[PDB]
Amino acid sequence: ILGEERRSLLIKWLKASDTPLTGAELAKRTNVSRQVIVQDVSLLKAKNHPILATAQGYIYMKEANTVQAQRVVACQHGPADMKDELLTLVDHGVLIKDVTVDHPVYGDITASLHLKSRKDVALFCKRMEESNGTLLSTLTKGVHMHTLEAESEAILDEAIRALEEKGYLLNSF
Ligand SMILES: [Zn+2]
C-alpha cells in the first residue's frame, strides 16, 4: 500500500506541476531513492500514464494552451559544438524536445531532452561530460536529428537559419 500511496502522490504532483520534477526531488518528497522513483514511474507507464522522463525531470504529458509549431531538423556538428548548438536553439525560444541518433546497432536512439533554458543546456552538458557521453559519438560523424517546437513557424525558421549560419545543419548533397 505504501508503494501505491507513493505512486498516487507522484501522479498528483506531476499533474499539478508546470515544470519537470527531478527524480531527486520526488525521491526526497517520498523518502525513497531515485532508483525507486524510476521503478514507480515505470509501473505508472505500464498503466498507460503518459509520464515522460526528460533531462530535467519527469513531466505528465498534457496539451498546451496554444498550438505549438513543430519541425524535424537534420543536424551535424563537430564533437565539441554541442553546447553552442543547443544554446543557439534555446536563445531563440525553441524547445529542444529530443535528439535522435541513427545507431548502427540499436537503430534510431531518441533521448527526451526537453531543453528549454540556458541552465538546462549548461547542466545537461555538465553532467554528460562527467560521464561517458557517447550518444553523439564517432559513429555518425556528428549527424543527428532534433524535434524542435516553438510558438510559430517563423520562430522555427529563424532558429534553423541560425543553425545554418553556424554550419550545424545537415546540408543536402
Ligand atoms: Zn544537436
Side-chain angles (χ1 to χ4, degrees):
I1 294 187
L2 166 53
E4 294 299 324
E5 291 174 344
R6 180 178 63 256
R7 286 185 285 278
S8 296
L9 290 170
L10 300 187
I11 297 171
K12 169 185 175 61
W13 295 332
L14 293 172
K15 293 189 61 58
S17 179
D18 196 35
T19 180
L21 295 180
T22 67
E25 172 64 22
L26 301 176
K28 287 182 294 188
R29 290 189 188 184
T30 59
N31 191 69
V32 298
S33 70
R34 183 218 153 266
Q35 177 63 215
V36 174
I37 298 299
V38 169
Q39 295 171 10
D40 285 339
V41 175
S42 298
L43 294 172
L44 291 174
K45 287 176 181 172
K47 300 232 167 320
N48 299 313
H49 292 271
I51 299 174
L52 186 64
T54 77
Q56 285 71 54
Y58 296 93
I59 61 178
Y60 203 107
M61 291 184 268
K62 78 180 161 154
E63 282 294 58
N65 201 85
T66 310
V67 196
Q68 307 288 298
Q70 279 191 349
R71 198 172 308 176
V72 180
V73 182
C75 306
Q76 181 179 26
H77 56 61
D81 296 322
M82 198 187 78
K83 184 172 191 175
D84 184 48
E85 182 216 36
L86 299 174
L87 287 175
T88 303
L89 293 168
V90 295
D91 283 356
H92 281 72
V94 168
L95 174 72
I96 311 169
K97 196 173 80 60
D98 57 38
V99 61
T100 305
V101 299
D102 189 336
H103 196 277
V105 178
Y106 299 91
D108 272 337
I109 300 180
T110 306
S112 308
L113 298 189
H114 197 278
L115 305 174
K116 197 180 177 58
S117 67
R118 286 187 173 177
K119 175 152 295 197
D120 293 344
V121 172
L123 192 48
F124 173 72
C125 298
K126 179 85 69 178
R127 293 170 333 175
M128 77 161 325
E129 90 162 359
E130 294 173 349
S131 62
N132 206 11
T134 42
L135 210 79
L136 203 289
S137 185
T138 56
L139 278 43
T140 49
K141 283 66 155 214
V143 180
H144 60 282
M145 313 297 296
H146 279 308
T147 302
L148 309 180
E149 76 179 46
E151 299 284 327
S152 67
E153 301 286 348
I155 296 175
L156 290 179
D157 294 337
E158 173 141 301
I160 294 167
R161 167 168 147 69
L163 290 185
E164 183 175 1
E165 274 196 20
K166 296 188 175 183
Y168 293 155
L169 286 197
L170 183 70
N171 289 112
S172 177
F173 69 112

